[PDB]
């Protein structure tokens, strides 16, 4: 089973055939770090970590599973909120802030007891958004509910119809108002393959 | 930009082939049976700092394996000589492009991690953090010198330029 964070914190803080072979998988750790970056509506995110006995390498060991209509609805909410924020309010951040000769900052002394700021959240009026009000900004929403998600592995989902109506209403910016495939006429994959094979160019299509 | 994005989508749709059947693959399940690895639960920013300092330590070990004393790697991943080189010292400084490629990948990773470290200290707003993360993945080619090390990487920048325009 697991282990408390203070041990691995001491391991990384205080620190060769067994040590040299563990550094082979470093870009794999880079990939596992970068695919689990927290969303703009989250403040913190806890992840499991595999680590060597001497602190050689650290992985994130988790696949970022989301529910797709919830994900599109959350990004549409962020889209509306960021449009509102730019029409209301701008200082872009100064890149790389930490200088070349100083080491990266210690987590245990500077972030560990400092409470974070507020995230980016929409208001979610409690009358119309009532099916989605209790779970719309969690990390993995509805994970511990047996009625919607099959279990802790968080693989399958099924919702009710007012929930789908609300998530379709909130995501109206990232979606199209199309109804039928009378659109994309001579502008779909097979017409593009035909223009590829005949070496001609559709107006608006690729070359 | 529309025509180039649609061109890359047509190429990905045309070159699609089903993957080969195989035995199912699990790396960390093999790592867990090894007693040399342990498991815990941490915060994302803490492990994001541990990963970049471990990458700095790995590149520093790869520098000091061949008994090199005249090179210096910054904490923000910049490699500079300390003096003017000679003939034999340039022959002893012949690393592959994979070295500088992993160096620029760790540089990109340290930019992405420290953008969050600056946020959780209360310095910038999340409204400004969302701009800052959007500038990095759009301007990898301007913030890093990673385009010099792989030329096919020129495909990856312009697509991120094209999505820069539309949005």
């Amino acid at each position: 089973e697991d282990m408390p964070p203070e041990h691995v914190r001491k391991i990384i803080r205080d620190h060769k055939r067994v040590y040299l072979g563990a550094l082979k998988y470093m870009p794999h750790a880079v990939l596992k770090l970068l695919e689990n970056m927290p969303m703009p509506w989250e403040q913190i995110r806890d992840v499991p970590v595999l680590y060597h006995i001497t602190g050689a390498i650290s992985f994130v060991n988790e696949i970022p599973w989301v529910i797709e209509p919830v994900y599109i609805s959350q990004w549409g909410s962020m889209w509306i909120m960021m449009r509102r924020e730019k029409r209301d309010r701008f200082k872009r951040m100064r890149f790389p802030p930490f200088d070349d000769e100083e080491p990266p900052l210690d987590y245990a002394d500077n972030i560990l007891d400092v409470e974070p700021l507020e995230a980016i959240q929409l208001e979610l009026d409690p009358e119309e958004d009532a099916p989605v009000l209790d779970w719309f900004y969690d990390h993995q929403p509805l994970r511990d509910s047996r009625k919607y998600v099959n279990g802790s592995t968080y693989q399958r989902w099924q919702f009710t119809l007012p929930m789908m109506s609300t998530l379709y209403r909130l995501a109206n910016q990232l979606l199209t108002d199309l109804v039928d495939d009378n659109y994309f006429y001579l502008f779909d994959l097979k017409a593009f393959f035909t223009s590829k094979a005949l070496n001609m160019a559709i107006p608006g299509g690729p070359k | 930009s529309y025509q180039k994005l649609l061109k890359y989508y047509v190429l990905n749709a045309l070159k699609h082939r089903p993957p080969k059947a195989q035995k199912k693959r699990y790396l960390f399940r093999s790592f867990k049976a090894t007693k040399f690895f342990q498991s815990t639960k941490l915060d994302w920013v803490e492990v994001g700092l541990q990963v970049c300092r471990q990458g700095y330590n790995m590149l520093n070990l790869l520098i000091h394996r061949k008994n090199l004393n005249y090179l210096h790697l910054d904490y923000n991943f910049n490699l500079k000589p300390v003096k003017t080189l000679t003939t034999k010292e340039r022959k002893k400084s012949r690393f592959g492009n994979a070295f500088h490629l992993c160096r620029e990948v760790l540089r990109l990773t340290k930019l992405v991690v420290d953008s969050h470290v600056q946020y959780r200290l209360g310095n910038v707003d999340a409204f400004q953090l969302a701009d800052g993360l959007q500038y990095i993945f759009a301007h990898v080619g301007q913030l890093t010198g990673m385009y010099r090390y792989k030329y096919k990487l020129m495909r990856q920048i312009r697509m991120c330029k094209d999505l820069k325009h539309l949005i």
Partner: peptide, 23 residues
């Protein structure tokens, strides 16, 4: 000596995914 044997056994387990097909 044992640690290199452990990493070689893990590498042989990684190569076991395609062992009868590749050779």
């Amino acid at each position: 000596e044992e640690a290199d044997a452990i990493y070689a056994a893990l590498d042989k387990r990684m190569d076991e995914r395609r062992k009868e097909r590749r050779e």
